[PDB]
Design an enzyme around this catalytic site. Structure first.
Site, PDB file in Angstrom:
ATOM      1  N   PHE A 189      11.428 -32.999 -16.544  1.00 57.05           N
ATOM      2  CA  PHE A 189      12.158 -33.306 -15.329  1.00 57.05           C
ATOM      3  C   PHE A 189      12.655 -32.030 -14.695  1.00 57.05           C
ATOM      4  CE2 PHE A 189      13.297 -36.668 -18.432  1.00 57.05           C
ATOM      5  CZ  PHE A 189      12.353 -37.561 -18.024  1.00 57.05           C
TER       6      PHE A 189
ATOM      7  N   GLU B 101      15.884 -33.499 -21.500  1.00 59.21           N
ATOM      8  CA  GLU B 101      14.661 -32.878 -20.978  1.00 59.21           C
ATOM      9  C   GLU B 101      14.899 -32.163 -19.652  1.00 59.21           C
ATOM     10  OE1 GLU B 101      11.833 -32.521 -22.505  1.00 59.21           O
ATOM     11  OE2 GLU B 101      11.362 -34.271 -23.735  1.00 59.21           O
ATOM     12  N   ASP B 102      15.942 -31.328 -19.627  1.00 64.61           N
ATOM     13  CA  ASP B 102      16.240 -30.374 -18.557  1.00 64.61           C
ATOM     14  C   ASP B 102      16.731 -31.027 -17.282  1.00 64.61           C
ATOM     15  OD1 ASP B 102      15.644 -28.171 -20.134  1.00 64.61           O
ATOM     16  OD2 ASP B 102      13.537 -28.195 -19.508  1.00 64.61           O
ATOM     17  N   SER B 103      17.289 -32.219 -17.328  1.00 64.96           N
ATOM     18  CA  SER B 103      18.074 -32.658 -16.194  1.00 64.96           C
ATOM     19  C   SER B 103      19.545 -32.363 -16.434  1.00 64.96           C
ATOM     20  CB  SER B 103      17.853 -34.141 -15.922  1.00 64.96           C
ATOM     21  OG  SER B 103      17.909 -34.879 -17.119  1.00 64.96           O
TER      22      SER B 103
END
Ligand SMILES: [Zn+2]
Ligand SMILES: [Zn+2]
Ligand SMILES: [Zn+2]
Lengths: 47, 49, 263, 113, 66, 137, 45
Positions: free
Chosen positions: B47, F1-3
């Site tokens: 994301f 996951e990188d948010s």
RNA sequence: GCCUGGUGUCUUGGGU
């Protein structure tokens, strides 16, 4: 219909007091392109 | 389009068959596609854009 | 059975100890004061002229953030609940501002003190932009140079912080309990020795340290909650604590009403 | 463009009940209460209060998705008591404690005035 | 561009303290002490005043377009 | 996951908000000795193959005025081209990009090196951070 | 008819499109449309 | 009183 594209003010509801323009006037439910947020709303003619 | 309609979902590059799987739609506000996190691995998705 | 002991007090912040209540009630009071205590705030700006260097909605955005005196707001209605045609005296306050710079030199600074109340639900004390003193010019809005003019009409409305943060009466709410960690709700990170590496709470001297022998009381519950409510001046600190409790009551009352009507 | 109206968190649509009770017939004496246009603020307050009552055997809640301001609570009581009545009792207790609490703050406040 | 009305993180009003901060720097106070005198105790509020860059003084120099 | 989760109240007070500006340019073209395009508000009776959007925000000079909000497919610069051999012209107007909205900020009117009329319309809007927008340390 | 503004000397005047595009006062060839008559509203959010 | 058309070919800079 004689009120398309003419400027309008809303007098009831959550959007009361806001400027807009009649984008589409099919029947009873108008489409006002509100000025204040970038959104066009469905609205009843009594308002 | 309405709840529980099946749609085919896909991320490029389609390196193997699990790059294209059928998901059930759930209509939601805001403009991103939402995935349950456990499917990021077969798509090799994350994301960051 | 709930008890309160006010440690310090002044106009815009109250520091207090709250005791003999459940954790959940202390937390719900914290949330209610931030989110659901009504205030008054500008919500519509009619720009008739703006020849400054700032963009129209940029200036309008700053206007929404100006804190207004909201003392009598409980008798005022929400705009969405009023029976009238467009606005009127019962659901809005109208403010006006007009500034200009004459002279070819220097800069005219437009301050929040130039906001003039024009109408309003008399004679309720609502709508004036908050001031610290009488010689305090207040919040900087814009700056003007030769021939630049700003002439705007602002509509202020009643609202709550759930809709937009400009309607919040609080700023921070400091909040803590159990300064010596007797309940063991946290497990401290340390390199060498946990006690030397972690600073003391500012309320460490208000409770007594655990004795070196003392066994763990597995029945003890949190029981003393120290909190400080700061406000922006839109409401006085004592009003915020009182109306927080009041607002939370009607919400529970509304739930109670619905059960005895659904049968 | 797809942001919902922020006022939808607390304003109830006309065709939508603030509160909905349904049974859970899989076990005896269990109800599901769906609260519309409410938060953790209300929910956590009711939940702890209820758990200290001797005749409540199960109480829980979840906010299913933060983008929608609702939550659902599950409440089971023993055979004697009716769950819906017990909920009314929990409500009145907290209204009383807050009334008392508001009073004691007012008194202490004038002394420091 | 111009001093923000509120601290982003906590909401305390800081838009009325910008003029007071520049004056204190003329009197030779250090930045930490100037913020201390204004009672900006939490470091969320301190970043707002300490790190703002006042560009509006530059934009005003461009001779008005009416 | 990188948010990342952002504080909605910080956004409300102005964190990471930004202005966005887009300029549209147009000019009259020459096709002959006295055959030139012309800026005007085109009448439906005299001009063929008109666009589907509204023409009601144009003034009489063929140009929209600053301060008017515009949405996608609205015409902001009206221009016609005559049809070679009444009811002689063809629309050559410029609509706002379909995915955009905002306010007309400023309209430049001048002439180019060849002496024909020349306009620029700058539109401004404000972009507020929301789900999906990208950030980085 | 339509209000304009001179980019150099700020004089205001009108033009009925067929006039040449210049300022009457200084001859400057860069001009700007004046703002609409209509009122503009913003939600201050 | 229904139908309703706005370009291409490149080049360059970017995203994963
Ligand atoms: Zn009213
Ligand atoms: Zn801060
Ligand atoms: Zn001139």
């Amino acid at each position: 219909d004689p009120t398309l594209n003419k400027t309008v003010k809303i007098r009831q509801g959550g959007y009361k007091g806001k400027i807009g323009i009649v984008k589409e006037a099919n029947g009873d439910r108008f489409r006002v392109e509100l000025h204040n947020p970038n959104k066009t709303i469905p609205i009843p003619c009594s308002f | 389009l309405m709840d529980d309609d099946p749609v085919l979902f896909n991320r490029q590059p389609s390196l193997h068959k699990m790059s294209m799987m059928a998901h059930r739609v759930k209509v939601m506000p805001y403009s991103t596609f939402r995935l349950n996190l456990s499917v990021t691995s077969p798509y090799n998705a994350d994301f960051d854009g | 059975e709930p008890k309160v002991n006010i440690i310090n007090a002044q106009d815009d912040e109250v520091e207090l100890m709250l005791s003999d209540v459940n954790l959940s009630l202390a937390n719900s009071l914290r949330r209610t004061m931030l989110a659901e205590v009504p205030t008054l705030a500008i919500d519509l700006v009619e720009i008739k002229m703006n020849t400054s260097v700032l963009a129209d909605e940029f200036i309008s955005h700053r206007l929404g953030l100006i804190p207004l005196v909201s003392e009598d707001v409980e008798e005022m209605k929400y705009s969405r609940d009023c029976t009238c045609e467009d606005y009127c005296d019962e659901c809005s306050v109208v403010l006006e501002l007009s500034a200009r710079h004459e002279g070819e030199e220097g800069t005219t600074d437009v301050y929040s003190s130039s906001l003039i109340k024009v109408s309003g639900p008399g004679n309720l004390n609502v709508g004036e932009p908050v001031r610290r003193d009488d010689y305090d010019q207040g919040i900087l809005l814009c700056k003007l140079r030769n021939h630049q003019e700003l002439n705007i009409r602002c509509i202020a409305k009643k609202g709550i912080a759930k809709e937009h943060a400009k309607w919040s009466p609080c700023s921070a709410i400091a909040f803590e309990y159990d300064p010596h960690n007797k309940l063991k709700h946290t497990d401290f990170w340390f390199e060498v020795d946990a006690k030397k590496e972690w600073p003391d709470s500012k309320y460490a001297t208000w409770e007594e340290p655990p004795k070196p022998g003392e066994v763990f009381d597995y029945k003890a519950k949190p029981n003393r909650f120290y909190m400080t409510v700061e406000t922006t001046g839109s409401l006085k600190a004592n009003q915020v604590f009182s109306r927080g409790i009041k607002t939370l009551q009607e919400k529970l009352a509304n739930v109670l009403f619905e059960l005895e009507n659904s049968r | 463009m797809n942001a919902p109206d922020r006022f939808e968190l607390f304003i109830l649509p006309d065709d939508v009940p603030k509160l909905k009770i349904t049974p859970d017939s899989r076990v005896p004496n269990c109800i599901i209460i769906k609260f519309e246009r409410e938060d953790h603020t209300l929910a956590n307050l009711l939940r702890e209060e209820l758990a200290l009552y001797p005749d409540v055997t199960f109480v829980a809640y979840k906010v299913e998705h933060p983008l929608f301001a609702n939550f659902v609570m599950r409440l089971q009581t023993e055979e004697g008591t009716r769950p819906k009545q017990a909920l009314e009792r929990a409500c009145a207790s907290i209204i009383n404690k807050l009334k008392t609490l508001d009073h004691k703050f007012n008194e202490e406040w004038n002394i420091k005035n | 561009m111009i001093i923000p009305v509120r601290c982003f993180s906590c909401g305390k009003v800081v838009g009325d303290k910008w003029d007071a901060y520049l004056r204190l720097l003329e009197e030779g106070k250090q930045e930490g002490d100037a913020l201390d005198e204004l009672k900006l105790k939490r470091y969320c509020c301190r970043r707002m005043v300490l790190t703002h860059v006042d560009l509006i003084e530059k934009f005003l120099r461009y001779n008005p377009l009416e | 996951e990188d948010s990342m989760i952002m504080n909605q109240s910080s956004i409300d007070r102005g964190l990471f908000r930004s202005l966005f500006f887009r300029s549209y340019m147009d000019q009259e073209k020459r096709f002959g000795i006295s055959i030139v395009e012309e800026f005007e508000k085109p009448t439906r009776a005299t001009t063929l193959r008109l666009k589907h959007g509204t023409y009601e925000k144009l003034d009489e000079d063929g140009l929209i005025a600053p301060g008017v909000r515009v949405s996608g497919d609205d015409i902001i610069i009206g221009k016609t081209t005559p049809i070679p051999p009444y009811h002689t012209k063809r629309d050559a107007s410029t609509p706002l990009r379909s995915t955009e909205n905002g306010i007309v900020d400023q309209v430049l009117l001048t002439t180019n090196q060849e002496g024909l009329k020349f306009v620029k319309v700058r539109m401004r809007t404000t972009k507020v951070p929301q789900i999906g927008d990208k950030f980085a340390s | 008819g339509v209000k304009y503004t001179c980019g150099a000397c700020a004089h205001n005047f009108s033009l009925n499109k067929s006039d040449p595009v210049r300022c009457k006062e200084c001859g400057h060839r860069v001009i700007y449309k004046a703002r609409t008559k209509r009122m503009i509203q913003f939600d201050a959010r």
